[PDB]
Amino acid sequence: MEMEKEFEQIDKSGSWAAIYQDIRHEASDFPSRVAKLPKNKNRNRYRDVSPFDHSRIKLHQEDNDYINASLIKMEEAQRSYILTQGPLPNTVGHFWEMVWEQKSRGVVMLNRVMEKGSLKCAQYWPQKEEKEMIFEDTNLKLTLISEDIKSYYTVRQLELENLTTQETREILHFHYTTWPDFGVPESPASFLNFLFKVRESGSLSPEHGPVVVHCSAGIGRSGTFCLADTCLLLMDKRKDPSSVDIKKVLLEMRKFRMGLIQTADQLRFSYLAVIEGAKFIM
Numbered sequence: 001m002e003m004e005k006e007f008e009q010i011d012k013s014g015s016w017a018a019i020y021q022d023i024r025h026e027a028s029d030f031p032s033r034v035a036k037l038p039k040n041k042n043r044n045r046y047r048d049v050s051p052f053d054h055s056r057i058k059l060h061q062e063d064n065d066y067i068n069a070s071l072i073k074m075e076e077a078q079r080s081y082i083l084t085q086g087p088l089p090n091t092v093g094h095f096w097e098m099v100w101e102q103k104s105r106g107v108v109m110l111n112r113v114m115e116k117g118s119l120k121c122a123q124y125w126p127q128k129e130e131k132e133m134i135f136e137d138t139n140l141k142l143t144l145i146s147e148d149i150k151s152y153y154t155v156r157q158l159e160l161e162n163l164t165t166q167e168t169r170e171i172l173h174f175h176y177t178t179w180p181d182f183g184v185p186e187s188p189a190s191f192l193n194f195l196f197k198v199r200e201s202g203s204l205s206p207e208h209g210p211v212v213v214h215c216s217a218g219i220g221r222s223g224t225f226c227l228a229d230t231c232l233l234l235m236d237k238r239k240d241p242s243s244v245d246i247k248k249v250l251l252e253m254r255k256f257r258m259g260l261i262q263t264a265d266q267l268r269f270s271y272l273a274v275i276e277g278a279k280f281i282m
Ligand SMILES: CC(=O)c1ccc(N)cc1O
Pocket: 103, 104, 105, 106, 168, 169, 170, 171
């Protein structure tokens, strides 16, 4: 079926939970043996969210190459994304090592450091220009260059230096700051505006390594971001845009990381975002 009328048909019939459970039942199951090794317990935020072995990002290190991060490679859309958990106190250096080694231009953050009164990720970037951060375990230096605070999101320019080679690179930090502590946004308008700002920066384009996207577990809000981006790109590429099937795209993405889209409300919100976004594109 088309999307907008499939949408009204699920609303009128109140069957979002049944649609979402079908997706959960059909989703791929692949091994994640490296994630479950005892030496990696303090590298995982949640025991039930792990990268598959076949798609995990490897650190360029011979001691321990593990990070909780996955490469989502969308062949028809010609887009790739790295989805990862919010960094932990003992993985902030690994996080920036990955950004460096994968040649990423942008980092997309969809959570606040504290939500619901608890810490959802480490404070992994500097908050003042004159107070830079050094990650001694991976030999990197990170400096805040500029910060632009808007009503729904903040964009930061960061300098990452590889202290071993003295090479430097400019990284863009795109921080969506207004996702509610509970539920999903009422309108997708600010989320879509944010997606378009990431696109306009070059961070999603083939001349760079894959964008790094995270929330707390790296599957819920993060899944919503890449699902909406890929669906809108396919609607532009195909002769028949009504052929784009958001459930099929989501199941393709779940071949590369488990659990993408965590609730039926996030599924409905993803439909809403693609529907409204397709009108603005034209
Ligand atoms: C030139 C290069 O390798 C490079 C990679 C990533 C980045 N954010 C900036 C850069 O200049």
